[PDB]
Symmetry: D2
Subunit: 159 residues, 4 copies
């Protein structure tokens, strides 16, 4: 009785969500019962805030794709339960916040995942490989596109 967990991290603008739908479409086109979840009020996928709300619903599905997984506090127990019930869990999440500090409870999922990959963005200042996200406003994050965030490399993140 075994599933697995695929983990996709990376900075903003690196394409995590698109890679998520590629892996999901791989199974869905092979007649898998696929469902996708994303975090509501972000800016065919379900929009929820707590994963404990959909624990009962997706019992009949074999493929679970989750976008913006760092926002779900119960992401780890959820993925472990589904992976132990024979379901394939694919997660696209941020590894670090704007302060390059760990995001919520998303790292505790790596000792439980079968595959972990980090994608790269393009730096919007020195047009090199970006691996960090940097907010442009004055708050201390807040969700947004590129108007307030930019994907940068190591040298451009510190001034």
């Amino acid at each position: 009785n075994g599933g697995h967990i695929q983990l996709i991290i990376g900075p903003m603008f690196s394409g995590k969500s698109t890679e998520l739908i590629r892996r999901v479409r791989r199974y869905q086109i092979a007649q898998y019962k696929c469902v996708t979840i994303k975090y509501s009020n972000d800016n065919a996928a379900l929009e929820v805030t707590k994963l404990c709300d959909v624990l009962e619903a997706i019992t009949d599905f074999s493929v679970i794709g989750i976008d913006a997984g760092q926002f779900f506090p119960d992401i780890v127990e959820f993925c472990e339960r589904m992976a132990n019930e024979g379901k394939i869990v694919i997660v696209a999440a941020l590894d670090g916040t704007f302060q390059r500090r760990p995001f919520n409870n998303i790292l505790n999922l790596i000792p439980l995942s079968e595959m972990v990959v980090k994608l790269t963005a393009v730096c919007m200042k020195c047009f090199k490989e970006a691996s960090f996200s940097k907010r442009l406003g004055t708050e201390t994050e807040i969700i947004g596109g590129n108007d307030m965030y930019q994907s940068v490399c190591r040298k451009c993140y510190i001034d």
Copy 2:
């Protein structure tokens, strides 16, 4: 410039990976353009030399259909342009193609993606006339 090459059987996601790699540059204020058999529909790649002269990022989908794929991609990468190609590596008989192999010794990055077998639900790496299958299901 350089050449990124993405191969794999049908239903493996080559086109989606193509647009991901292209969108990475496009979001960084690159002048990006895409070609299929911003968007272009052509039959011969030697015909589009004039159009994309002002572009730095070139994406090509279903590159095996272009007979001059090998000369075109190099004759674009040697002018500082980034070329990202999503193409099939093998025909229905898992036989070599006319002139898509000759592009790999010139590419800087080459990756082969996998599909899901539509018969035995395992890893798929071949195409059969359509269904994507593995080795056991291809020669059952």
Copy 3:
């Protein structure tokens, strides 16, 4: 600053150390100043903050079994901020599949992260976890074989 951090994780018997010396030999064969560190040819230390002064003249730093070094985090960042390339091969999870928090705190700071797989020693499929019973007391297993034992 000018450097970066490459992170190689995976269970035991997945080949992390071999991949480490491959990535280093790529730079070393290009006349880079490389140095390698291991836990107590490569230096053998217990605290990484002792060799901060020593390896100042090196551009490539490879570390094996990074989970054992408590100061792994503040080390790699400092080295990466001095223009140095830092390559780490460490375990992601213990035998209880619990995090090596010192290692996990390095991922939001790393430029590259990859997880390698081993081969299951019970049902011979892909393995991503380590279990206790040297090799005669550890085994690389998959999810199904980790719980059913």
Copy 4:
């Protein structure tokens, strides 16, 4: 008829051989009967002669496979006998010209990966090989 083929290409000094023995060590440490071939390990020039010998092995690793003329027939025949075949070969010559049958093996391979070296001129990403000894270079330096 239930095996597969893993393919490793790249220029010189990219680490293809080290990756080869890493992938083989993965299986060998899991009590697989592994054997390695170069131009327990055998050293031969034609692969079609050792078909009978390695019948009891499930994992076959080949290095510098471009030098074996019968690499394709061998890898297909061996993969169709439940054996895992891992090949590490050069993708391009010193003239950036295609290889004899290494490419004709890609439509038959289950996994294909290309590794990169470090440029020995501008210390950037290298993907090509050049002659003087030998050096791994990028596009601009070639």
